[PDB]
Amino acid sequence: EEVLWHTSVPFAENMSLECVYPSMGILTQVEWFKIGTQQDSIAIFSPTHGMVIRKPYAERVYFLNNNMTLFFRNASEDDVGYYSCSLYTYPQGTWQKVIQVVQSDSFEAAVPSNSHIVSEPGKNVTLTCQPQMTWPVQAVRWEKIQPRQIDLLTYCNLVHGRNFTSKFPRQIVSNCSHGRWSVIVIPDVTVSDSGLYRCYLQASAGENETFVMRLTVA
Amino acid sequence: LWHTSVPFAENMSLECVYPSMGILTQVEWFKIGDSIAIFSPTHGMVIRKPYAERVYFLNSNNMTLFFRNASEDDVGYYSCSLYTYPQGTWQKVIQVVQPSNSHISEPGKNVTLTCQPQMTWPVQAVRWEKIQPRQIDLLTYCNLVHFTSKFPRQIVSNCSHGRWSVIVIPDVTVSDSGLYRCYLQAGENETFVMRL
Amino acid sequence: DVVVQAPTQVPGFLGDSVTLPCYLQVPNMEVTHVSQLTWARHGGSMAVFHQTQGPSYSESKRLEFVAARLGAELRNASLRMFGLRVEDEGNYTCLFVTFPQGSRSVDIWLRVLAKPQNTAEVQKVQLTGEPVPMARCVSTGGRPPAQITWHSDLGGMPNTSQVPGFLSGTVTVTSLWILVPSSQVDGKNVTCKVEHESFEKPQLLTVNLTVYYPPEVSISGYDNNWYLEATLTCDARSNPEPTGYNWSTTMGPLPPFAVAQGAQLLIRPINTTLICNVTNALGARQAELTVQV
Amino acid sequence: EDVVVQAPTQVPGFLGDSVTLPCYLQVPNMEVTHVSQLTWARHGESGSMAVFHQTQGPSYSESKRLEFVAARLGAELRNASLRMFGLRVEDEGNYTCLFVTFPQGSRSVDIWLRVLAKPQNTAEVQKVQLTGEPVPMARCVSTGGRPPAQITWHSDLGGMPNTSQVPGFLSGTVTVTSLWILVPSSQVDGKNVTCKVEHESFEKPQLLTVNLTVYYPPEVSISGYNEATLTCDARSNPEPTGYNWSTTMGPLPPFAVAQGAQLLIRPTLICNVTNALGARQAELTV
Ligand SMILES: *[C@@H]1O[C@H](CO[C@@H]2O[C@@H](C)[C@@H](O)[C@@H](O)[C@@H]2O)[C@@H](O[C@@H]2O[C@H](CO)[C@@H](O[C@@H]3O[C@H](CO)[C@@H](O)[C@H](O[C@H]4O[C@H](CO)[C@@H](O)[C@H](O)[C@@H]4O)[C@@H]3O)[C@H](O)[C@H]2NC(C)=O)[C@H](O)[C@H]1NC(C)=O
Ligand SMILES: *[C@@H]1O[C@H](CO[C@@H]2O[C@@H](C)[C@@H](O)[C@@H](O)[C@@H]2O)[C@@H](O[C@@H]2O[C@H](CO)[C@@H](O[C@@H]3O[C@H](CO)[C@@H](O)[C@H](O)[C@@H]3O)[C@H](O)[C@H]2NC(C)=O)[C@H](O)[C@H]1NC(C)=O
Ligand SMILES: *[C@@H]1O[C@H](CO[C@@H]2O[C@@H](C)[C@@H](O)[C@@H](O)[C@@H]2O)[C@@H](O[C@@H]2O[C@H](CO)[C@@H](O[C@@H]3O[C@H](CO)[C@@H](O)[C@H](O)[C@@H]3O)[C@H](O)[C@H]2NC(C)=O)[C@H](O)[C@H]1NC(C)=O
Ligand SMILES: *[C@@H]1O[C@H](CO)[C@@H](O[C@@H]2O[C@H](CO)[C@@H](O)[C@H](O)[C@H]2NC(C)=O)[C@H](O)[C@H]1NC(C)=O
Ligand SMILES: *[C@@H]1O[C@H](CO)[C@@H](O)[C@H](O)[C@H]1NC(C)=O
Ligand SMILES: *[C@@H]1O[C@H](CO)[C@@H](O)[C@H](O)[C@H]1NC(C)=O
Ligand SMILES: *[C@@H]1O[C@H](CO)[C@@H](O)[C@H](O)[C@H]1NC(C)=O
Ligand SMILES: *[C@@H]1O[C@H](CO)[C@@H](O)[C@H](O)[C@H]1NC(C)=O
Ligand SMILES: *[C@@H]1O[C@H](CO)[C@@H](O)[C@H](O)[C@H]1NC(C)=O
Ligand SMILES: *[C@@H]1O[C@H](CO)[C@@H](O)[C@H](O)[C@H]1NC(C)=O
Ligand SMILES: *[C@@H]1O[C@H](CO)[C@@H](O)[C@H](O)[C@H]1NC(C)=O
Ligand SMILES: *[C@@H]1O[C@H](CO)[C@@H](O)[C@H](O)[C@H]1NC(C)=O
Ligand SMILES: *[C@@H]1O[C@H](CO)[C@@H](O)[C@H](O)[C@H]1NC(C)=O
Ligand SMILES: *[C@@H]1O[C@H](CO)[C@@H](O)[C@H](O)[C@H]1NC(C)=O
Ligand SMILES: *[C@@H]1O[C@H](CO)[C@@H](O)[C@H](O)[C@H]1NC(C)=O
Ligand SMILES: *[C@@H]1O[C@H](CO)[C@@H](O)[C@H](O)[C@H]1NC(C)=O
């Protein structure tokens, strides 16, 4: 099965993985770990016993100062993979932000637009994405492409429903239910909302569809 | 099958409001299966027997067929056909036969109606209807496997995948208030009514 | 009482033009007023003719009212459709807006046709011992698909199948005449009959079968009444035709009284078992005959 | 050291056209081999579609559709290239080229024949009037393509596309139609939208620019802020047919004199401008 990420960043030597967890419930533990078959814990934070960094990450990673940004000092080729920033609280249980680290050459930020939407601040921006050539569509996702990172805003799996909670610091009105998944709304739009908004559609054989919409706020 | 369903009554009226398009040629009222009435803007109105003593009209883009003392025999499908240049033929089919649930409102706003399905079964057909105690009018019809709205009010709806359950009503007036029924077809069927 | 008279089916051809006849029959006793003519597909109007405004078409330079004219009684709603397409095949409603008789309409089924091109060829086989295609009959780009039937006294079972033709809507019908190959069927012909609505007569295509088999040799000319000159003949058949004829005996070479003269053996005035070895591209086959003097 | 069959992995052929499937047997300089037969077969088919014997010559399943272009009697069989006349959609598949050699044995190679059709690209304007709901304003058609062509758009306006596939005039081909839906406005009138069509048969993607056309009522404006003169200018498509001056009460006061767009005031004004779409007014307190 596919690994769902919330943020995608390129590989770097002084690479930092941002994780700003909300102040909610009875805080139990905050931890970093590399997603894989083998147990690979990086750092574990206790609200009473402080921070503990496991080997062989003890000489590669560090922290500064609700923000758990994981900084790296000379990262190796092997550090390319999926990272998790998990927050354990009562009575919620688990909060997880998955960060994907990709190769410097494989990461693309300079992508061309298809439509340019101009909107006044405070209004609701409605973004639509309809299948053009391929049908039945299995998955639909919305992304905000920045020059140094890509953030997953929405994700809907229509063939077999999956768990997706956006860790984006902005409210996005969306519904994965049948007859509602094509339209996503950004309510009370700010000047900071300006950027590239890519839509990705996945089919059965593997044929994909991309629709990039550029937003500009006055 | 029909655009408006009206229950049987002694002094029942079959509403037919056609759009003011092109040049009017002839307006016709006939039972699907006898010809009731024919209107010509040049020749005039002609009502046929035995409907001559049963039906009447009140008078400009409206052709409602009224009944004096309708009998149980007058049960079936009625057609209100409009012949215009250069559009051609326009037709409104009506049928005569013998719950509040959700509630949702400022005037002149874009009111959105959503049909949330409870059943997991894949939806093949969706139809929206306006329910009144005297008549049930079909708003929009959508078939996701393989129609023109006869309703005088403008309703924006998309038939494409991922938008079929949403219908918007732009610039809502006082007359738009009432019951809005949604029907979903797979096999299995679901019904949802919304108050306005 | 007024009735619309029009044929039930109208056949047309791809890229060609066709007229859809439709006229209003009015009895000499009744008076009518036709104010409009309408043409529409099943189930948006295609062609409209008004009593004062004249004609109006949805398609440019494709539809035309062949008889309707302004200042003349609207009775013939006959419409000509130019450059027919497979998408045009369907049921069309011809309507007459009459007063005070009301609207009178009829339905005409427009059928789009395509003349198929027929070819037939042999399938060169060998003695496989299993049923294989021995003849081929093809009918390309036909709408509707053509009917292919085989006529033979040899037997066989056909395998007719169809694939879409060059133009979308046309069908290419391919029929293989399957039979277990034998020496007896070689050279003999099989006919293929192609039947289609566009043909003036069904097309007949003849195909001669080809079977590759080694020689089938037999010696004749011995009436079993030899007493102390007669000629023996080596009767052989093969495809391809024989390349050699060799006469010998089980003991070895031919005796001085037995003289070989091609495919024949002359006996001059004893017990010998003569052999005739006949060769072709497939191989050599022998036949033995016991002669007594 | 060993005999190898030189042939491409895939061969792109065009529908209606004739293609040659290249298949040659490379024999080392001093190596001696005896090729006695060439065979062509389809993956899944019951038998062979083309056979060439060193002394018996060729045998074809479809003798008027197939030909051995480089195989002849009285010559060493080294080139088994086969020409296919009048390409059909049913001819798309994997083919096997065989060389019966001695004492090395049979040598085979698989070639994937792909039947293509170069689509014809057309782009036209969808002229429309002012409406609240979004309607098509541009059309991009890629007629009869195999495989169906990919149509994308580039705009400086926020318009969503609708694409619909309908079969072309030839079987196996697809006419791809793409509409550019956007809510009309006076701003997009004259502004251009580019359509990009991508296909395997093209040298590079084809770009088609389309100028947008909107039919809108007048956008009335008055200039000129003791005698003075005011001019009435309005933007519409088609251009205004008539201009009229009046007041909130009714007819013009005794000091104001007007003729169409120009108004003279001597020591609240309304300007009614009309076109084919309708009439619009502009209130101005003086
Ligand atoms: C043009 O119109 C003809 C006639 O149809 C008639 O007009 C239509 C507009 C509509 O109002 C119809 O209701 C009306 O009959 C079309 O021909 C008809 O084709 C349908 C199939 O598409 C036939 O329907 C039946 O379907 C049954 C399964 O549900 C099936 O069992 C029937 O088969 C039996 O009957 C046929 C002979 O009719 C016989 O050959 C079979 O062996 C079997 O017993 C049948 O298929 C209608 O019967 C057809 N009617 C006629 C008169 O042929 C035509 O398809 C249409 N053309 C286009 C392109 O749309
Ligand atoms: C009766 O005839 C049909 C038609 O197929 C014929 O096959 C050859 C003999 C040709 O020379 C033609 O005359 C004609 O096309 C037979 O059905 C077909 O069987 C074949 C296998 O033999 C199937 O082929 C496959 O096709 C798919 C793609 O569609 C490929 O991916 C496969 O690799 C493989 O090639 C084919 O699907 C099937 N149907 C058609 C319409 O082609 C049928 O077997 C035959 N019956 C008898 C008893 O002889
Ligand atoms: C002609 O042949 C090609 C090539 O297919 C294959 O080529 C070899 C490498 C062997 O694997 C052969 O057994 C076989 O002929 C056909 O294309 C191929 O189609 C298949 C599906 O039928 C593809 O397989 C899968 O593809 C998915 C998606 O890419 C993968 O996730 C799977 O792991 C699996 O590989 C195959 O990739 C594809 N090949 C190419 C190069 O695209 C082709 O369909 C065939 N033509 C006809 C008409 O039969
Ligand atoms: C099938 O074989 C027969 C006999 O060989 C062919 O008939 C001869 O055809 C020629 C045509 O050039 C005529 O001039 C002769 O009169 C025919 N008869 C004879 C006895 O020679 C027939 O044409 C062959 N058919 C096919 C399609 O090959
Ligand atoms: C991080 O890396 C860049 C380039 O690799 C380097 O120039 C810069 O000094 C570094 N910044 C910090 C804050 O470490
Ligand atoms: C999290 O902390 C790092 C380091 O102090 C800082 O660069 C980053 O901006 C912080 N994130 C937020 C959202 O404050
Ligand atoms: C999966 O569910 C957990 C809560 O149980 C949530 O924290 C996490 O973000 C979800 N995964 C994704 C990819 O959103
Ligand atoms: C859309 O805008 C209105 C502005 O009044 C706001 O009330 C509404 O909540 C917005 N829609 C959504 C989905 O947030
Ligand atoms: C049509 O006319 C009748 C009689 O005047 C009236 O009751 C009905 O409401 C009219 N319809 C509309 C939509 O005005
Ligand atoms: C006019 O109608 C007659 C039948 O009454 C028909 O034979 C004739 O072909 C029609 N005219 C044309 C031009 O089709
Ligand atoms: C028949 O003739 C061929 C060719 O001359 C020869 O090779 C073969 O040995 C002969 N067969 C017999 C049994 O003599
Ligand atoms: C094989 O034949 C083809 C077609 O005649 C030709 O193009 C090709 O050059 C030949 N290959 C060799 C190596 O001779
Ligand atoms: C309401 O709908 C109309 C028509 O679609 C549109 O012009 C208007 O901008 C919409 N208003 C809002 C606030 O979305
Ligand atoms: C939208 O796309 C569908 C195909 O998915 C097509 O049939 C329909 O005509 C299109 N609608 C509009 C309004 O462009
Ligand atoms: C499209 O319009 C822009 C200005 O909005 C202009 O720079 C560009 O050259 C135009 N392109 C064409 C081909 O007219
Ligand atoms: C504007 O002019 C038109 C055409 O003469 C007229 O119908 C309309 O009533 C006028 N409006 C005003 C406010 O004078």
Contacts of C2 in chain B (CB under 8 A): none
H-only helix segments in D8-159? none
- Map residue A78 onto helix, strand or coil: helix
The DSSP output letter for A124 is P
Q: Which helix (H) or strand (E) holds D45?
A: none
Q: Which fold has domain C116-212?
A: Immunoglobulin-like (2.60.40)
- Sequence letter at residue B62: N
Residue of D nearest to A210 (CA): D152
3-state helix, strand, coil in chain C (%, to 5): 0, 55, 40
Before C240, cis peptide (omega within 30)? Answer: yes
Which phi and psi angles does D91 have, rounded to 5°? Answer: -85, -10
Give the C-alpha separation, D2 to D130, whole Å: 75
| A156 alpha carbon – ligand 5 mean position (Å) | 37
List the single residue in C123, C163, C166 with the smallest CB-CB distance to D61: C123
Task: Of D85, D72, D161, D74, give the one whose Cα is nearest residue D123.
Answer: D161
Q: CB D132 to CB B160 under 8 A?
A: no
Give the tokens for residue B15.
Answer: 């509403």
Rounded distance between C-alpha atoms, residue B32 and residue B1, angstroms: 12
CB B37 within 8 A of CB B31: no
Question: What's the CA gap between A39 and C211, in Å, rounded?
Answer: 72
Nearest to C136 by CA among C164, C171, C177: C177
Query: What distance in Å separates the CA atoms of residue C86 and residue D119, rounded to the nearest whole number?
Result: 20
Give yes or no for a contact between A79 and A71, defined as CB atoms under 8 angstroms apart. Answer: no
Report how far residue C121's alpha carbon sits from residue C111's, in angstroms, rounded to the nearest whole number: 32
Q: How far is the CA of D184 from the centre of ligand 13 (A)?
A: 12
Instruction: Tell whether A132 is within 8 A of chain D (Cβ).
Output: yes
Amino acid residing at D151: I
Which amino acid is located at C34 in the chain? Answer: V
Strand partners, C264: C233, C261
What fold is seen in the domain D119-215?
A: Immunoglobulin-like (2.60.40)
The span from the CA of D231 to the CA of D224, in Å, is 7
User: Within a 10 A sphere around the Cβ of D248, how many other Cβ atoms?
Assistant: 9
Q: Reduced to 3 states, what is the DSSP secondary structure of residue C208?
A: strand
Phi, psi of B51 (to 5 degrees): -65, -15
Both structure tokens of B155: 């309703």
Work out the number of other CB atoms within 10 angstroms of the CB of residue A208.
Answer: 10
Q: E strand or H helix at C232, and its extent? A: strand C230-235
| Nearest-10 Cα torsion for D263, D266, D270, D273 | -10
Cα C31 to Cα B43: distance, rounded to the nearest angstrom:
14
Cβ-count burial B165-182 (b if 16+ within 10 Å, e if not): bbbebeebeeeeeebbbb
Instruction: Verify B-C touch: 3 or more CB pairs within 8 A.
Output: yes
The rounded Å distance from CA A197 to ligand 14 centre is 24
- Closest by Cα among C93, C77, C114, C97 to C198: C114
Residues from chain D that touch B160, judged by Cβ atoms under 8 A, are 162
Determine the residue type at D234.
Answer: A
Closest Cα to atom 4, ligand 10: which residue? C23
DSSP E strand stretches across B32-124: 35-40, 44-47, 55-56, 65-67, 77-85, 88-97, 102-103, 111-114
What does DSSP assign to residue D131?
-
Residue of C nearest to B45 (CA): C100
Which ligand lies nearest the alpha carbon of D273?
16
- Residue D36 is encoded by which pair of tokens? 């006695």
Please indicate whether, in this complex, the C-beta atoms of B89 and C100 are within 8 angstroms of each other.
no
CA distances in angstroms from B39 to A217, C66, C98, C106, listed in the order given: 57, 29, 11, 22
Q: Which is nearest to D96 in space by CA: D59, D45, D56, D58? A: D45
How many angstroms separate the CA atoms of D214 and D113, rounded? 48
Q: What is the DSSP letter of D8?
A: -
- Cα distances from A191 to residues A25, A113, A118, A182, in angstroms, run 32, 19, 11, 25
- Give me the count of residues in chain D: 286
Tokens of D150: 């990919």
DSSP strands (E only) in D146-268: 150-154, 160-167, 174-182, 192-198, 206-211, 214-215, 219-223, 228-235, 242-247, 256-259, 262-265
| Resolution of the solved structure (Å) | 2.8
The SS3 of residue A79 is: helix
* Burial profile D126-154: b = 16 or more Cβ within 10 angstroms, e = fewer: eeeebeeebeebbbbbbbbbbbbbbbbbb
Cβ-based contacts of C121 with chain D (< 8 Å): 62-64
Q: Which CATH class is domain D1-118?
A: mainly beta
Contact between residue C105 and residue C77 where contact means Cβ atoms under 8 Å apart: no
Half-sphere exposure at residue B164, Cβ-oriented, CA atoms within 13 angstroms: 23
Min distance B110 CA to chain A CA atoms (Å): 13
Residue among C124, C163, C168 minimizing CB distance to D169: C168
In angstroms, the CA C38 to CA C48 distance is 5
Q: Please give the interface size between B and D, counted as residue pairs whose CB atoms are below 8 Å apart.
A: 5
User: Chain C residue with minimal CA distance to D15?
Assistant: C166
Distance from CA of A125 to the nearest CA of B (A): 15
Q: Cis omega before residue B86 (within 30°)?
A: yes
Domain boundaries, chain C: 1-115, 116-212, 213-293
Q: Return d(Cα C170, Cα C293) in angstroms, integer.
A: 74
Most C CBs within 10 Å: which of B30, B31, B45, B85, as the mutation test of the C interface? B85
Distance separating alpha carbons of residues C168 and C190, to the nearest angstrom: 32
Positive or negative CA dihedral for A19, A20, A22, A28?
A: positive
Token digits of residue C270:
């004893």
Any B CB within 8 A of A130 CB: yes
Length of chain A: 218
Structure tokens at D104: 């090395």
- Which chain D residues touch A130 with a CB distance below 8 Å? 160-162
Which tokens in the block code for residue D108? 């085979």
The approach used to solve this structure was X-ray
- CA B140 from chain centre, in angstroms, equals 9
Task: Kindly give the number of the ligand 16 atom that is closest to the alpha carbon of D272.
Answer: 1
Q: Which residue on chain B is closest to A159 by alpha carbon?
A: B122
In degrees and rounded to multiples of 5, residue D53 shows phi and psi of -100, 140
CA distance A206 to A202: 7
How far is B54 from B13, CA to CA, in rounded Å?
12
DSSP assignment of B102-138: EE---TTS-EEEE----S-SPP-EEEEEEE-SS-EEE
The identity of residue A130, as a single letter, is: Q
Give the three-state DSSP class for D147: coil
Atom of ligand 1 nearest to the CA of C109: 1
Check if CATH label 3.30.9.10 holds for domain C1-115: no
Structure tokens given for D145: 């393509």
Query: Is the omega angle on the peptide bond into residue C256 within 30 degrees of 0, that is, cis?
Result: no
Q: Does residue A184 sit at the D interface (CB-CB below 8 Å)?
A: no
Contact between A179 and B163 using a beta-carbon 8 Å cutoff: yes
Q: Cβ D167–C166 below 8 Å, yes or no?
A: no
| d(C-alpha B192, C-alpha A50), whole Å | 54
